[PDB]
Structure 1
Amino acid sequence: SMQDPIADMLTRIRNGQAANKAAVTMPSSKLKVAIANVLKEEGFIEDFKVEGDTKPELELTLKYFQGKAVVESIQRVSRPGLRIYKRKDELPKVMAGLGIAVVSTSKGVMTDRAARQAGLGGEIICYVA
Structure 2
Amino acid sequence: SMQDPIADMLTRIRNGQAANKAAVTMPSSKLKVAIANVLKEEGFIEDFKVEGDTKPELELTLKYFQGKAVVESIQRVSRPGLRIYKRKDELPKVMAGLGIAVVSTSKGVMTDRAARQAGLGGEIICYVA
In the TM superposition, what is the alpha-carbon distance from 1:78 to its structure 2 partner? 0.8
Give distance in 2, aligned partners of 1:55 and 1:67.
32
Match of 1:117 in 2: 117
Query: Are the counterparts in 1 of residues 6 and 32 from structure 2 also a CA contact under 8 Å?
Result: yes
Q: TM-score, normalised by structure 1?
A: 0.96
Offset at residue 11 of structure 1 (A): 1.1
CA positional deviation for 1:48: 1.3
Q: How big is each residue's C-alpha offset from its partner over 1:4-59, in whole Å with a ceiling of 9 and x where there is no partner? A: 11001011100111111111110000001100011101010001111112111010
Structure 2 residue ranges without an equivalent (≥5): none
Determine the structure 1 residue equivalent to 2:73.
73
Percent pairwise identity? 100
Q: Deviations over 1:51-72 (max 9, x none)?
A: 1121110100111003311101
Report SS of the residue matched to 1:49.
strand
Aligned residue-pair number: 129
Gaps spanning 5+ residues in structure 1: where? none
Distance in 2 separating the partners of 1:25 and 1:7:
15
Structure 1 runs of 4+ with >6 Å offset: none
Q: Say what the alpha-carbon RMSD is for the aligned residues.
A: 0.9
Alpha-carbon shift at residue 116 of structure 1 (Å): 2.3
